[PDB]
Structure formats: C-alpha cells, structure tokens
Amino acid sequence: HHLKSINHICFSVRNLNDSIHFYRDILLGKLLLTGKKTAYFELAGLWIALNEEKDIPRNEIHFSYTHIAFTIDDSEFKYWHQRLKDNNVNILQSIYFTDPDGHKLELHTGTLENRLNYYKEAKPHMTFY
Amino acid sequence: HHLKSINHICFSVRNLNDSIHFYRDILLGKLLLTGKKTAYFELAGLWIALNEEKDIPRNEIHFSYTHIAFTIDDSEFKYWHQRLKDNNVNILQSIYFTDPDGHKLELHTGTLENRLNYYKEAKPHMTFY
Secondary structure, eight states: OOOOEEEEEEEEESOHHHHHIIIIIISOOEEEEEOSSEEEEEETTEEEEEEEOTTSOSSSOOOTTEEEEEEOOGGGHHHHHHHHHHTTOEEOOEEEEEOSSOOEEEEEOOOHHHHHHHHHHHOTTSEEO | OOOOEEEEEEEEESOHHHHHIIIIIISOOEEEEEOSSEEEEEETTEEEEEEEOTTSOSSSOOOTTEEEEEEOOGGGHHHHHHHHHHTTOEEOOEEEEEOSSOOEEEEEOOOHHHHHHHHHHHOTTSEEO
C-alpha cells in the first residue's frame, strides 16, 4: 500500500508575474497553465503549482520551516551560481537561495546514498538503518 | 542546463519521535538515519529530511504557504482515508491533511495531464500552454 511518488508541490506567492519569471526564466521550468491567481509549471519533472495571495505580509518572516532541493550535476554548479547571481536572486555541494517571496530552495549535486556515506565518515555517532 | 529532478525536502518538526511515527508508521516511509535532531527517510522514492526545532511556537499559525502532494492509486483512496482517520491524523480526488506539526500534505489520485484536461472542460477561460 505505499505512496507511489511525489505528485506536485504548491507554493503561495504574492505576485504571479514575478514568480513566473523566476520559475520559468531563471529556473528554466515549463509554463503549462495560467489563471488570474494560478500558474502551473513542470520543473525538474515535477508539477509545481503557484497560488497568488497578494496579501501575504511582506514585513514578517514566513516560509521558515520547509526547504525544497533540486538536483544538478556537479559540473553545473558554477553555471547555476552565476545564473542566480546575475539575476539578483537572494543566495544564502549546495547553493541555498529563495524565490521572490522567500520560499527556501536549494540546488544540490549529490544523492541520498552519497550523503549517508558522508555521514558515516563525518558524523559516525549518528544511527544508520 | 535544466534542473534534473527533485533531490529532497526538509521539514522542521517539534518532536522527532512523533514525526518518525508519522512518516515511518503512518505513511509507510523507510527510516534511513537518525541523530539527536535529525531523521532521514525515503518516502514515495523521495529523500525527506526532518530537522528537530523544539521551540517552533505551538500557539501561532505556521506552514501556511506550502503543500506537498503524493500520488496514490484511485483504488487506494478509501484505504488511506481510513488509515489516516484511524491514526487520528488531522484531515482537512484528494485527501488533505497535516503532519503532527502542521505541514500541509495531500494524497492525490491524478496526474498533471489529468488536471490540465479537467481544467480545459471546467475552467475554460484559463490559458493553456
């Protein structure tokens, strides 16, 4: 009875047109649908839905407790770093960054297996299953 | 130069042992690693990382602006509905629910293609690309 796969992710965003430029132009996703308050993309093989909420407060911290990471090839690290820098993206191996609203994103060059093997050497008092 | 795939998701959680029971026992994910403040799972083919933050306020609304949906087969809908109900999960075709902390999750039985075709009939004034 297991869950089969990730199906989609939805993000609330304050300005649809800023978020379409981010996900479509900067991150090279495919725009598939728009409405007044909605946009769907396919990005990295994943359906991403954006829901526009123009009243999310800009003077408060939100989006603190989740991050989403996408895979890139190690050889593409400098290309992506430079692409995000040249697009004035908020940047915090991995590249940590935010979308225009503050949703926390990451580009990462390794696998879960790579990370487990790293921790078995670096953090050997963790418990491995 | 495209992003290749989703790599992982990380959630902050207030109690690791409550969240391991949710993701491992209720959602049938695989526990791969633990530390004092960390747990890694593979769930639905996706690496999920949990980071324990015991001080996330319990008396405030958080996690409002993201949701993550997983695919199930249509025939499994009543099995999952009943499994979440029998485990006293907060439940809000799709099943909408939250983890123990309030991260918003969904089980969904359709594809992006199915949803686009639905909107072309139901919401024909959207723009399709």
